Amino acid sequence: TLHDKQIRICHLFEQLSRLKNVGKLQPGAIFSCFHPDHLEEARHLYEVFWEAGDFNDFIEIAKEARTFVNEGLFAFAAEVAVLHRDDCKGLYVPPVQEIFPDKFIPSAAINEAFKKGNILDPEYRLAYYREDVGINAHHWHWHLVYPSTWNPKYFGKKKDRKGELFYYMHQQMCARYDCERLSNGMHRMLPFNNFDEPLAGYAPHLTHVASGKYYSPRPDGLKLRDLGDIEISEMVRMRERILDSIHLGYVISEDGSHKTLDELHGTDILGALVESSYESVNHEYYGNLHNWGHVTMARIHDPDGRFHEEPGVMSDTSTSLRDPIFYNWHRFIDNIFHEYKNTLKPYDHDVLNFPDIQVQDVTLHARVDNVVHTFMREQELELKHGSIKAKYYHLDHEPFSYAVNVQNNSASDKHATVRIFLAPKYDELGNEIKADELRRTAIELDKFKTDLHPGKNTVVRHSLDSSVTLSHQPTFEDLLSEYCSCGWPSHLLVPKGNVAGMEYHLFVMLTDWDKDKVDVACVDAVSYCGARDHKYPDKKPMGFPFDRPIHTEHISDFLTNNMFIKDIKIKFH
Ligand SMILES: [Cu+2]
Ligand SMILES: [Cu+2]
Structure with missing residues (x-):
């Protein structure tokens, strides 16, 4: 907790924008908190950071890795490290909206101060909630205290009822958004449960100064299509296998045996296999539903990369709440948990x-x-x-x-x-x-x-x-x-x-x-x-x-x- 240590941590995330198997994702690119390949490299860097012998060494390889690794990846990995290292207990991590102000402030405002219109869609009425700096900030931090890649044996300790908290935190973001729709005279949000439906659009107007690129907009009318890493019919298959299990009252483990969805731990078991965290009882069978929806919705404008356009605001936890479809997708996910609570x-x-x-x-x-x-x-x-x-x-x-x-x-x-x-x-x-x-x-x-x-x-x-x-x-x-x-x-x-x-x-x-x-x-x-x-x-x-x-x-x-x-x-x- 010494001020000396705080100042040193504060320098690590200052003007952002053994290490063999890190540095695969390019600087300048937008890091995805949901794509499997992106999170694997994030895991490797926070593993190097937790394995570091002491605070002198952690600051050393960290100071070293930020000169060549992606800045989103580094920020993610450095915050998981500060939060879980014993020697870092007492130290804060500096506001995410200060590290990357370009993910919270409009592109125009950033541009209008670099060394120095009217509304046509009712959803703009709710921008005070979705685009709030603090809500987006909280969402970033929540996923770093509770990461989907958390391996309980590696760290020697469990995150208690993490699957049930994934469910509850997201159910509450949805419930709080609906109180805002009804406050503004609008209907409660509908779940995106027919995966063939065209999605409504959203233009984020956020630049990524680190490369002069941007979080890609989504026009109205596009429908989810197969990306090279996942097909949409594979997501429909994951949903069906989960509802099956919910209606049967048991889940099938990797070894083919049956775990029961009892009243004590059923929500937690289900939260781990729906989000898909490391703790899922059977990843090959139940998949990674919630996180693959974020990825297919985030790259819907360029499913296979030929346009070399960056992902949308849905690929990042600091920006996904800004997008109206976040709530459609999460009311669909909340319905899986709701279908279970109803049994x-x-x-x-x-x-x-x-x-x-x-x-x-x-x-x-x-x-x-x-x-x-x-x-x-x-x-x-x-x-x-x-x-x-x-x-x-x-x-x-x-x-x-x-x-x-x-x-x-x-x-x-x-x-x-x-x-x-x-x-x-x-x-x-x-x-x-x-x-x-x-x-x-x-x-x-x-x-x-x-x-x-x-x-x-x-x-x-x-x-x-x-x-x-x-x-x-x-x-x-x-x-x-x-x-x-x-x-x-x-x-x-x-x-x-x-x-x-x-x-x-x-x-x-x-x-x-x-x-x-x-x-x-x-x-x-x-x-x-x-x-x-x-x-x-x-x-x-x-x-x-x-x-x-x-x-x-x-x-x-x-x-x-x-x-x-x-x-x-x-x-x-
Ligand atoms: Cu989230
Ligand atoms: Cu989510």
């Missing part, structure tokens, strides 16, 4: 009820009570480390707090985990969204431990303490819970809502912490990012109580005593 039996009163506890009231305090206000806000970005500043505007909300009045009818002190979620009340056509439909649109706002003393209790919690968000990201000139960069953007905690004020259900559930607790640095954004070197500190399935099918029609009829829904309104300006 699970609805929770019983016993698993939901926390018996002597009764939540009596919930109030959101914020200028006007039970109303949250959002607006746009400017921020600058320093471009001199990856040029000087560039201003942009993002969604932000006003600070708020929750006041939950609990009644502990026990004669002793209980310990509870307060679970807070937010879900829209109506759809864009004024209809009440039924209980089961809410499962797909409920976003996690918080999860924290509280102590309940007998009788009346009033739990106060502040929006800034949210277990979903990153509370701090120090700039490059700052470096010259803690030190990790994963976490949802604070300014994007709740949705935009509209000018009249949109209705949202604020759900609060209190469960028994002595049943949820599992046995720690970087728990700032625990919900979405987990904890460093520790297993996920909640035994309940991610998204509880919304992951299994709810058979009641209205969600208020689903409520037990330890649950409460307060209807609030989010208003924009």
Whole structure:
């Protein structure tokens, strides 16, 4: 954690733009976080970096490898290294939007400051969400804490419930996007499940200064076609083999034997073979579905390379959320997991009820009570480390707090985990969204431990303490819970809502912490990012109580005593 070490790490990712089997991908080219060949070389470099004898040696071969290796590859590999090396514990890694400002700021803005029009598509209304600097940044960091190439034996340690977190992090990005479509009066996103459908287009307007090239645009009307490395009918075959297994209740291992998709580990098993991580039980049979969709959608404009055009924004984790088809593709992937959760039996009163506890009231305090206000806000970005500043505007909300009045009818002190979620009340056509439909649109706002003393209790919690968000990201000139960069953007905690004020259900559930607790640095954004070197500190399935099918029609009829829904309104300006 010495400042000396931080400054040295800070120099490694300064103006970016034994090592035999590294240096296959060219400098200047756009690195793909999803293509198998690209990730294999990324693995080799972070393996060299973790094998390095000490911090003196790690900085040495690293300083050495960046002079000839691709800068995307190097950044990926160097961040996995800083994050997992014991000697690097305490050290931050500098903002990705500062390393490569050209992946977060428009091509025009970069051009308009190098040594110094009107809207025609409704999707532009949602650019505040998809093109947000912090959301794209988070997505980069999330995949580096949880990489698909992670080999648990090599590193001597497991990433707990990584397959289940792949599912949950991506289900939440989709659920949060839909709250933004409905906020803007639009329908919920449809899944790209017929692979013969023509895709809608997107032009990213992002240059790749390192070579004077760009992330290739996608016109409207192209349909997925076979690339040299994969055929589309092979992806249809992977989807069918997975649904098969989901409906049978078991998965077939490489040795031909049957692993069962039980309630404990089934989501994790399935997450490992759908994304396709190293931990997949049978890669030759189930494939690499999620990651091959990213690749075929990213190179759809040049399936076989003859045009020598770079991939689209879908090939990178720092830019894929910008593209509207990211959500179509991930709602299709979320449907695979949703088809599995539906084979699970609805929770019983016993698993939901926390018996002597009764939540009596919930109030959101914020200028006007039970109303949250959002607006746009400017921020600058320093471009001199990856040029000087560039201003942009993002969604932000006003600070708020929750006041939950609990009644502990026990004669002793209980310990509870307060679970807070937010879900829209109506759809864009004024209809009440039924209980089961809410499962797909409920976003996690918080999860924290509280102590309940007998009788009346009033739990106060502040929006800034949210277990979903990153509370701090120090700039490059700052470096010259803690030190990790994963976490949802604070300014994007709740949705935009509209000018009249949109209705949202604020759900609060209190469960028994002595049943949820599992046995720690970087728990700032625990919900979405987990904890460093520790297993996920909640035994309940991610998204509880919304992951299994709810058979009641209205969600208020689903409520037990330890649950409460307060209807609030989010208003924009
Ligand atoms: Cu992702
Ligand atoms: Cu993805």
